Design a protein around this motif. Structure first.
Motif: not given
Ligand SMILES: *CCCCCCOCCOCCNC(=O)c1ccc(C(=O)O)c(C2=C3C=C/C(=[NH+]\C)C=C3[Si](C)(C)c3cc(N)ccc32)c1
Ligand SMILES: [Cl-]
Length: 291
Positions: A18-25
């Motif tokens: 599956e594809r998990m979304h995430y913020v990365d800053v």
């Protein structure tokens, strides 16, 4: 001003097919800060916290499987599913040591991961987190009847899955100030289709209240015991009257948990990040600088 925008490029990682979304800053080096939302939110709940932390630390804020912009496989969405997916997310990113910033069901994931990987956790900031609730008397009276209905076989699914009550009613009832229609649309987006609402229903049915479900009571008791013995830096945010963590519980915890600092954010219910994000982010930042 409390901003409603979400100015983060999407990042995706393949996890368990599956594809998990995430913020990365934030910067690439140093210890990363891993933000875990709960029910019925997404990384959107952190949108006004992250700007306080990204100046100095990498900020990683995934969407739990089944929510936000992550894929929505047709699963039971048992708590163990989330454990497995989050375990896979953390390994897929190659994370080694982390700081946890955790809320609601994201706190059960974070505390359970910390118990199993105690050496990798440098600090835990938490708010309105999952703890054992021995009696419904400990659940806020204004919220008791609906959450009891959520935890029923048929009525519960009719409310949450069919009528979307967790999003349209419970979520705003978790914030003291009124959520706007722009904010509400961000929270509605992942669940416009009834078939995608299973996570919203399984989560209140896994809350460890009055001994059930017993397996989740056990798991939560395990990591609360670990938290009481761990020396890890702890930072607890609470509000009045709160939902999961009333002011008296917060005060107790500030004395019983080692190396624990507790911060009163003022009026708050469950989504404390929506009532006082400025205090919560600024305090996480100064706490991080002293770790
Ligand atoms: C990890 C824990 C997360 C904690 C989240 C915050 O939890 C505390 C808040 O829950 C309080 C009670 N929960 C409700 O969902 C609630 C209570 C009363 C009513 C009602 O007015 O009858 C509803 C309800 C609403 C409420 C507000 C609405 N707009 C702002 C809309 C509804 Si509707 C029309 C979708 C609705 C339909 C049905 N069949 C029953 C209740 C409601 C919700
Ligand atoms: Cl819940």
């Amino acid at each position: 001003e409390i901003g409603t925008g979400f100015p983060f490029d999407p990042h995706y990682v393949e996890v368990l097919g599956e594809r998990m979304h995430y913020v990365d800053v934030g910067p690439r080096d140093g210890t990363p800060v891993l933000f875990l939302h709960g029910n019925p939110t997404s990384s959107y709940v952190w949108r006004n916290i992250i700007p306080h932390v990204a100046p100095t630390h990498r900020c990683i804020a995934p969407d739990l499987i089944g929510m936000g912009k992550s894929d929505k496989p047709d699963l039971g969405y048992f708590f163990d599913d989330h454990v497995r997916f989050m375990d896979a997310f953390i390994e897929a990113l190659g994370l080694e040591e982390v700081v946890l910033v955790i809320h609601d069901w994201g706190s059960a994931l974070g505390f359970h991961w910390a118990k199993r990987n105690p050496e990798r956790v440098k600090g835990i900031a938490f708010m309105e987190f999952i703890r054992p609730i021995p009696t419904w008397d400990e659940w806020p009276e204004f919220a008791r009847e609906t959450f009891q209905a959520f935890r029923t076989t048929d009525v519960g699914r009719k409310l949450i899955i069919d009528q979307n009550v967790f999003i349209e009613g419970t979520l705003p009832m978790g914030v003291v100030r009124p959520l706007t229609e722009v904010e509400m649309d961000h929270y509605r987006e992942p669940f416009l289709n009834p078939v995608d609402r299973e996570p919203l229903w399984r989560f209140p049915n896994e809350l460890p209240i009055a001994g059930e479900p017993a397996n989740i009571v056990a798991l939560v008791e395990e990591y609360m015991d670990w938290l009481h013995q761990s020396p890890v830096p702890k930072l607890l945010f609470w509000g009045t009257p709160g939902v999961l963590i009333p002011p008296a519980e917060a005060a107790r915890l500030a004395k019983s948990l080692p190396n624990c600092k507790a911060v009163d954010i003022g009026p708050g219910l469950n989504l404390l990040q929506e009532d006082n994000p400025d205090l919560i982010g600024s305090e996480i930042a100064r706490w991080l600088s002293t770790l």
